[PDB]
Amino acid sequence: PQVMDAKWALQGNCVFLEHIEGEEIKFGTINAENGPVARIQTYATGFEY
Amino acid sequence: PQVMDAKWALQGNCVFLEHIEGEEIKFGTINAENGPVARIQTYATGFEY
């Protein structure tokens, strides 16, 4: 194509926090990562004689 | 266990002093040495989707 769309990916997050006793476990989160975008030009010249 | 007990040991203390004749020999001593303590914790994390 004239312009190339961006790749996408999904990732998780979590941290192992200390749990003494009876502490409610904290919950993690997810996040999304996306790529860059590229496109192509047209170049052209000629002759006349 | 959650906590680990210390290692123990006995050793004898002694010293050689000069003995001019007729002097009474001096007696020694024992002592007890104990090691360190360690413990183990709990870490945790989770998700809720």
Distance CA A2, CA A39 (A): 6
Q: Tally Cβ neighbours within 10 Å of residue B45.
A: 14
Query: Do the beta carbons of residue B47 and residue A15 sit within 8 Å?
Result: no
Nearest CA in chain B to A25: B45
Cβ–Cβ of A19/B43 closer than 8 Å? yes
Distance CA B25, CA B14 (A): 12
Any bridge partners for residue B46, and if so which? Answer: A27
Cβ–Cβ of B47/A20 closer than 8 Å? no
